[PDB]
Amino acid sequence: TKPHVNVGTIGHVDHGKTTLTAAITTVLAKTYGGSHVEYDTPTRHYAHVDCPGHADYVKNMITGAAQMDGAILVVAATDGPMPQTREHILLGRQVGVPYIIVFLNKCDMVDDEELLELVEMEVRELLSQYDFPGDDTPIVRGSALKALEGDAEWEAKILELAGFLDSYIPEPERAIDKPFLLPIEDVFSISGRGTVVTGRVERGIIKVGEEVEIVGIKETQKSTCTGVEMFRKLLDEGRAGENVGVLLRGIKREEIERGQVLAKPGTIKPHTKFESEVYILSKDEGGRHTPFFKGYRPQFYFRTTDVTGTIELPEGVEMVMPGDNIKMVVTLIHPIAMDDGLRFAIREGGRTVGAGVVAKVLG
């Protein structure tokens, strides 16, 4: 099945993002035949969003919009970077967009090669100021509107941009290829005193005979898979996306619980403290009616279970209103298995009142 890549445009309001995106779809359809837009290269399927607002993007990443695998920074060469181009790139650093490609627009209106070079060098320097690899960044000199009008020269620069989407953004890793992890939902014992744990394989593959770690909540334990079960049917392996039972060697029912994960040994660790980006639902979205303050003590819902945590707000921040998004540092009352990028819900009394992403594990 065709690799899927999430991309986004970012840049000044009239430097050409929309026009560029229309040009990408038009020229690819012309060349290869046939809210977000979609388009295909021969090797890749793309879903493409625009990033007109900082808070809006951050809130969308948190509430479920797929994270950009690569972004397209659109700068009109007629101007060069604007004062706020700094801020566009800084959003990129903030959300950790892995790659940024640049499309310099309206290059047809800059007849002077040395001035195009000045702009190009400015963009590389701004990128490197935020630890993007400015010197190695693909920069396309194009013209979106003229490509859209069918000018072959400028169409070719659209195909150059698409090739860089193909070449410069790595094929994203598929769940089935990641180290095996199963979020544990229920725990039973069969009669041959064999413990079974159930769940939907999040990623990778568990085969009979392989060692696993049980991670989160309690001291990590080690076991060996002695069987995989799918609706009473005995299987030889369980794969990402499948609902399975995993039978375990020796470990007893009382020693495992919901909220732990099964994992390939040495690949996921339990943590108690992390930095996160959080969105608190508004009243209309079904969330809290009133603000909370520094002593807010909610539950953080990771995969299959709730963990109570305390929070630290950013310097200068004393109050969080429904509808805000902010950074917070969380300290859970016991550890849970987690990596950077892990989504969680924030709950009170069992009701979801916010959403977040682990931005950096701390301890």
Partner 1 sequence: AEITASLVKELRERTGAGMMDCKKALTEANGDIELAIENMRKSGAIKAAKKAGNVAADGVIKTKIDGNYGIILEVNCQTDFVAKDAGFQAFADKVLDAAVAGKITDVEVLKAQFEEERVALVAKIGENINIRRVAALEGDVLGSYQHGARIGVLVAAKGADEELVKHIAMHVAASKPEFIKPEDVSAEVVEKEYQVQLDIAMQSGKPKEIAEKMVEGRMKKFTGEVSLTGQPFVMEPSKTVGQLLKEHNAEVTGFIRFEVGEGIEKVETDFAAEVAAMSK
What positions carry a catalytic annotation? 14, 17-18, 54
Judged by CB, which is closer to partner 1: 217, or 278?
278
* Adjacent-strand bridge partners of 225: 248
Give whichever of 40 and 79 is closer to partner 1, judged by the CB atom: 79
Task: At 4, list the tokens.
Answer: 């899927």
The rounded distance, in Å, linking the Cα atoms of 262 and 107 is: 54
User: Minimal distance in Å, beta carbon 285 to partner 1?
Assistant: 16
Letter string b/e over residues 332-355, b meaning 16 or more CB atoms within 10 A of that residue's CB = beebbbbeeebbbbbbeeeeebbb
CB 168 to partner 1: min, Å: 22
How far apart are alpha carbons 17 and 360 in whole angstroms? 31
Structure tokens at 84: 């706020």
Closest CB to partner 1 among 79 and 160? 79
- What DSSP line would sit under 3-62, residue for residue? -EEEEEEEE-TTSSHHHHHHHHHHHHHHHH----EEEE-SS-EEEEEE---HHHHHHHHH
Name the minimum Å distance from CB 277 to partner 1. 15
Q: Are strands 139-141 and 100-105 parallel, antiparallel or unpaired?
A: parallel
| Longest CA–CA separation in the chain, Å | 81
Question: Closer to partner 1 at the Cβ: 21 or 299?
Answer: 21
Closest distance between partner 1 and the C-beta of residue 31, in Å? 14
Pairing relation of β-strands 186-189 and 195-200?
A: antiparallel
Considering the complex, what minimum distance in angstroms separates the CB of residue 351 from partner 1? 18
**Across the strands, what pairs with 105?**
76
Question: Nearer Cβ to partner 1, position 1 or 290?
Answer: 290
Residues forming the site for partner 1 (CB under 8 A): 12-14, 18-19, 21-22, 25-26, 35-37, 49-50, 52-55, 77-80, 82-84, 86-88, 91, 109-110, 112, 114-115, 117-119, 148, 290-291, 293, 318-319, 321
- Pairing relationship of beta strands 70-76 and 4-11 according to DSSP bridges: parallel
Contact in structure between 184 and 197 (CB atoms under 8 Å): yes
DSSP alpha helix (H) spans, the chain = 17-32, 54-63, 85-94, 113-129, 144-148, 152-168
Q: Please identify, using beta-carbon distances, which residue of 32 and 188 lies nearer to partner 1.
A: 32
> Beta strands 305-312 and 325-337: pairing type?
antiparallel
